[PDB]
Structure 1
Amino acid sequence: HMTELLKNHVAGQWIAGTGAGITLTDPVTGVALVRVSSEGLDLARAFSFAREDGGAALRALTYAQRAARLADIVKLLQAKRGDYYAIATANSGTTRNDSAVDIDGGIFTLSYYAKLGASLGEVHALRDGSAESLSKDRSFSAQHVLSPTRGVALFINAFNFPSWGLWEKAAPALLSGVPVIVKPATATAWLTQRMVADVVDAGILPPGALSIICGSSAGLLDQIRSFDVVSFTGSADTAATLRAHPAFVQRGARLNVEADSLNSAILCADATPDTPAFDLFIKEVVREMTVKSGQKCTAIRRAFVPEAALEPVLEALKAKLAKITVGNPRNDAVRMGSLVSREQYENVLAGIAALREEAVLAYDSSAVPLIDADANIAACVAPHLFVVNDPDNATLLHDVEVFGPVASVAPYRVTTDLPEAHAVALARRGQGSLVASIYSNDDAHLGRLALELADSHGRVHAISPSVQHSQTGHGNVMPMSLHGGPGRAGGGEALGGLRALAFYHRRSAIQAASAAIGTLTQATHW
């Protein structure tokens, strides 16, 4: 008959959507995999069962009891990784090492929060800061506290990280006692739904704590109320429709947005072709263009290098990109797989054609035949490297994101009265980004330059020879560090270790006699 129709888990029950559903397909082979549908679901019940039953059940447990359930989920996901790697190969067309960024990235992030959470103790509220006297005699004092929000957390997640986007958000939400409703992007929804089905089947979390809807998003935001939270990852276009909905404009629900981000990499003036730091730069650029076919939100899109260094840069990138083979990830000779879908492949080819009108194409290996795949079926795109000689006057470099294995290089004028001042200005023209990386032989220089980029980048990632062996990667998101960025990148904050708990809590100043603050404090932790 037809491929499997994945059920939704809502109000404590597995429920199928009506109709024919939307088919997910293998972006390499064109094979139909599974279908999704949310048609006819009772969204009022889905949200009320989560918010009431789900939230009460979670709030009755302490942080440490919730953290122990996260640890149990870690052991479950780890035991089923073989099933996960099989879905990733078919649904996303990624190499095994690239599938690991999503699978094992998600599982590592969940484990981090399970360990952090065990330290929060057997309490139901947390202390923010210490107590402060409000009187000369200290008879009357103030203590701030954090309490779980009496709402649900709705995650609208991007197609690139069906696993990591689930767990990076769900770990702090569930540790904070807040029930989760996840809505993965349709094209790659399968891994998200299987991971949720696995956890729900195991009965680790209370009923109502974890729900999933796949298919149309129609009607979800209409269920959002003032004590709920929403975390959206997607396009800047979509983000502006979302922001205008009454849930936020009239009802004031908290919202996090992650959106388009034209991340930068800056080769410092001292890192000339003869020094160790030059090759670190070449290597990282090619890495971020090619991991998942450049489908990380954090991937380098703009690379800025001294005028003098432009030729040697273009030559070194050409030579490294040449080693990147493209095709079917089932073949071990393949270095880089497909984009997530043929639809995205069209977006990316359109993006390349619009950039070509203002830039020169320095590298493009599109004529090379794919390994074990047909270019007229598969969503494979070859790396493309553009050159923009006049970035001050460029119309498209700083504005148009191409969500593929594509990047533009541009020279900057060395300031030799920071030497990297013009590069700092150019990175800013991206109007606000998740991350910038910076490359130098000089560790002390990196500190100064980093502060110059800090007010327009959520993370600044500095690479130099003393950390060639230890630096954690431009595009890789360590969960103990902030993830998000200002401006175009959306104005959002996630992760950052303990920092992530605040989005899910309500903060309150308690002002009382000192013995009352003492008793409050006995019921809390930090």
Structure 2
Amino acid sequence: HMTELLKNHVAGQWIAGTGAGITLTDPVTGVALVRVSSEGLDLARAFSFAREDGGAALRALTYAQRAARLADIVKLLQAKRGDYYAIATANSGTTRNDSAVDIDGGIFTLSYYAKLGASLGEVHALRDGSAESLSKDRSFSAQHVLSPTRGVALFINAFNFPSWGLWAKAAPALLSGVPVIVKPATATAWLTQRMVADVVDAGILPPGALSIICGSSAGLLDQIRSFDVVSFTGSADTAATLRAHPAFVQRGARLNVEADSLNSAILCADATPDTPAFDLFIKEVVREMTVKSGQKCTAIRRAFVPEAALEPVLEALKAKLAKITVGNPRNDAVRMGSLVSREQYENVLAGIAALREEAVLAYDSSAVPLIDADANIAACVAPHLFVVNDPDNATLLHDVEVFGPVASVAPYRVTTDTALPEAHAVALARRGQGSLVASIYSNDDAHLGRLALELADSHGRVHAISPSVQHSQTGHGNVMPMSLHGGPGRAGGGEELGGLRALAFYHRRSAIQAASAAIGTLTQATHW
């Protein structure tokens, strides 16, 4: 008698992998929860049934018909949230509020796209921009269109967001008429598989539209062909092995990468310790370090503050981090639970030791006993705050991501000649080699507009926090589905979400050049 072996959904059937499988475990208590395996699956059939049946059946439906099916999946996921929260507590060791970022974040984003999708109407292709004359008499004209790619969407998803990573990607893919095969990271795969099971069991989507494989990834990319698309989230080192696969180098399948990102937070010159913007910065830093134990891809890793503001910053961060209780998320006194696994705990400990070689530890509450948890079993890590006094000559600050409740503060030299006062901090943020997000904090709303444009070429999102929006700003690390998610360089060169922008990744663009009456008839069969 062993724990449940979770089956895969492939070629319209629930199939168990062979062998003993891989055990998922509770990262707080060490209890064995469920097992996964992909051993022995027929991956040629899995990919063909999705691509041929799943794709033809989705393409038969209009956008608005697909959107209505996403609305029904929203209602189903909401009705089962109690089950999802139980699995999150056990498999991920997250506080209820932190579980919500993944569960309800996923559902909210799915709902956003169901609503947006309803507006795309009862058509099978979309218009890109308007018609343009190609002739003096306007008898011959051109109109670009977007048509769903005749392939499958493979999602290789990270362990931190088993729900959101599924729905953030699946919602625009299914809206686009493209069938989904999700491969969630093993350690936290249970929620992804239960949600897929719930949806598949309800029969909302056609057969073949949504498939799941949990276990080994071996042989998956071998099945990818030129009209397929892949979206990978995970380590930069893995990313580079993936990109060398023949699916991409020889077959040219489209790829999106999200990888390591040393996201920055920049305290502006004007945000001194007497001003309201100073506290907003302290709070935002501590929230990003601690939500999910710092396991968001978008968490603040590097915090750049004026030389003069360095000691007051460290003191204020020390005091706010001290209120952070760590342990078992079942106890309501706990503010921050565990990392996802004891294996991740070891990578985080190892990252911490590596940073320590070039930074001073300003804060670490590792001697505080855990609440309702044994430190020798649980994958709990206490917040750790590093200070790097010389970031220009810094070796590791800008290059080593520690995927845990860890961040480094560094001073920058204020520019008070005339450019931006924050010019040095922009330069230091850029040394992270391209990131998902930077946030900037100031009392002056107008100044944040100027500064933002200086970070925009190296960050997929610039998030500006100031007293006028203390009540409304949506958070450094919280990804709003109407806004772009991705970043250049190190962060992977990828783009997803950004509302309608997400649909392009799933379609083929074409310029149609024709008699005006032909363009008129095309336009009658399309929408934007």
TM-score where L is the length of structure 2: 1.00
Give the aligned CA root-mean-square deviation in angstroms.
Answer: 0.2
Distance 1:358 1:205 in 2: 53
**Displacement of 1:151 after TM fit?**
0.1
Distance 1:37 1:238 in 2: 21
Distance 2:16 2:426 in 1: 51
Distance 1:83 1:419 in 2: 50
**Displacement of 1:368 after TM fit?**
0.1
Distance 2:352 2:383 in 1: 11
Distance 2:247 2:219 in 1: 11
Indicate the residue corresponding to 1:465 in structure 2: 467
- Cα deviation, 1:353-374, whole Å, max 9, x if unaligned, reads 0000100000000000000000
**Displacement of 1:249 after TM fit?**
0.1
Mapping for residues 488-499 of structure 1, pairs under 5 Å: 488-499=490-501
Residue 478 (structure 1) aligned with residue 480 (structure 2)? yes
Residue 88 (structure 1) aligned with residue 88 (structure 2)? yes
- Cα deviation, 1:361-414, whole Å, max 9, x if unaligned, reads 000000000000000000000000000000000110000000000000000000
Distance 1:434 1:45 in 2: 36
Matched pairs, number: 526
Residue 176 (structure 1) aligned with residue 176 (structure 2)? yes
**Displacement of 1:435 after TM fit?**
0.2
Distance 2:399 2:523 in 1: 50
Distance 2:394 2:526 in 1: 55
**Displacement of 1:432 after TM fit?**
0.3
Distance 1:338 1:459 in 2: 28
**Displacement of 1:263 after TM fit?**
0.1
Distance 1:395 1:177 in 2: 46
- Cα deviation, 1:152-209, whole Å, max 9, x if unaligned, reads 0000000000000000000000000000000000000000000000000000000000
**Displacement of 1:474 after TM fit?**
0.1
- Cα deviation, 1:217-254, whole Å, max 9, x if unaligned, reads 00000000000000000000000000000000000000
Indicate the residue corresponding to 1:242 in structure 2: 242
- Cα deviation, 1:104-131, whole Å, max 9, x if unaligned, reads 0000000000000000000000000000
Indicate the residue corresponding to 2:290 in structure 1: 290
**Displacement of 1:330 after TM fit?**
0.1
Distance 2:398 2:147 in 1: 41
**Displacement of 1:215 after TM fit?**
0.1
**Displacement of 1:493 after TM fit?**
0.1
The 3-state SS of whatever aligns with 2:477 is: coil
Distance 1:102 1:334 in 2: 19
The 3-state SS of whatever aligns with 1:350 is: helix
The 3-state SS of whatever aligns with 2:475 is: coil
The 3-state SS of whatever aligns with 1:172 is: helix
Indicate the residue corresponding to 1:189 in structure 2: 189
Distance 1:421 1:128 in 2: 38
Distance 1:75 1:430 in 2: 41
**Displacement of 1:496 after TM fit?**
0.2
**Displacement of 1:294 after TM fit?**
0.0
- Cα deviation, 1:76-112, whole Å, max 9, x if unaligned, reads 0000000000000000000000000000000000000
Indicate the residue corresponding to 1:424 in structure 2: 426
**Displacement of 1:512 after TM fit?**
0.2
The 3-state SS of whatever aligns with 1:247 is: helix
**Displacement of 1:38 after TM fit?**
0.1
The 3-state SS of whatever aligns with 1:512 is: strand
Distance 1:517 1:357 in 2: 65
**Displacement of 1:424 after TM fit?**
0.2
Indicate the residue corresponding to 1:200 in structure 2: 200
For 1:507, which of 499, 502, 509 is the aligned residue? Answer: 509
**Displacement of 1:498 after TM fit?**
0.2
Distance 1:86 1:56 in 2: 36
Distance 2:3 2:85 in 1: 20
Indicate the residue corresponding to 1:373 in structure 2: 373
Indicate the residue corresponding to 2:31 in structure 1: 31
**Displacement of 1:31 after TM fit?**
0.1
The 3-state SS of whatever aligns with 2:264 is: strand
The 3-state SS of whatever aligns with 2:252 is: coil
The 3-state SS of whatever aligns with 1:266 is: strand
Mapping for residues 36-435 of structure 1, pairs under 5 Å: 36-417=36-417, 418-435=420-437
The 3-state SS of whatever aligns with 1:343 is: helix
**Displacement of 1:517 after TM fit?**
0.3
Distance 1:187 1:304 in 2: 34
- Cα deviation, 1:481-526, whole Å, max 9, x if unaligned, reads 0000000000000000000000000000000000000000000000
The 3-state SS of whatever aligns with 1:344 is: helix
The 3-state SS of whatever aligns with 1:75 is: helix
Distance 1:53 1:361 in 2: 56
- Cα deviation, 1:413-470, whole Å, max 9, x if unaligned, reads 0000000000000000000000000000000000000000000000000000000000
Distance 1:139 1:386 in 2: 67
Distance 2:387 2:72 in 1: 50
**Displacement of 1:19 after TM fit?**
0.2
Structure 1 unaligned residues grouped into runs of 5+: none
Distance 2:238 2:504 in 1: 25
The 3-state SS of whatever aligns with 2:211 is: strand
**Displacement of 1:335 after TM fit?**
0.1
Distance 1:391 1:123 in 2: 54
The 3-state SS of whatever aligns with 1:324 is: coil
**Displacement of 1:286 after TM fit?**
0.1
The 3-state SS of whatever aligns with 1:444 is: helix
The 3-state SS of whatever aligns with 2:120 is: coil
Distance 2:499 2:395 in 1: 38
Indicate the residue corresponding to 1:524 in structure 2: 526
Mapping for residues 427-466 of structure 1, pairs under 5 Å: 427-466=429-468
The 3-state SS of whatever aligns with 2:440 is: strand
Distance 1:137 1:350 in 2: 70
- Cα deviation, 1:320-369, whole Å, max 9, x if unaligned, reads 00000000000000000000000000000000000001000000000000
Distance 2:394 2:143 in 1: 53
The 3-state SS of whatever aligns with 1:461 is: strand
* Moved >3 Å (runs of 4+): none
Seq. identity, %: 100
**Displacement of 1:213 after TM fit?**
0.1
Distance 1:291 1:339 in 2: 11
Distance 1:388 1:71 in 2: 48
Distance 2:44 2:312 in 1: 60
The 3-state SS of whatever aligns with 2:54 is: helix
Distance 2:123 2:392 in 1: 55
Distance 1:376 1:302 in 2: 29
Distance 2:201 2:363 in 1: 49
Distance 2:122 2:472 in 1: 36
**Displacement of 1:42 after TM fit?**
0.1
Distance 1:337 1:307 in 2: 34
- Cα deviation, 1:46-76, whole Å, max 9, x if unaligned, reads 0000000000000000000000000000000
Distance 1:223 1:21 in 2: 23
Distance 1:519 1:454 in 2: 40
